[PDB]
Amino acid sequence: GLXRKXLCAXAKKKXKCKXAXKLXCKC
Numbered sequence: 001g002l003x004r005k006x007l008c009a010x011a012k013k014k015x016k017c018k019x020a021x022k023l024x025c026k027c
Helices: 003-012
Strands: none
Touching: none
16 A cells, blocks of 8 residues: 555565565565
């Protein structure tokens, strides 16, 4: 859920970190 946190999960995640809530724009 949530556009910016879509964009983040988009750039921060193909070929990129594991499935945790607060970890969103890191993984």
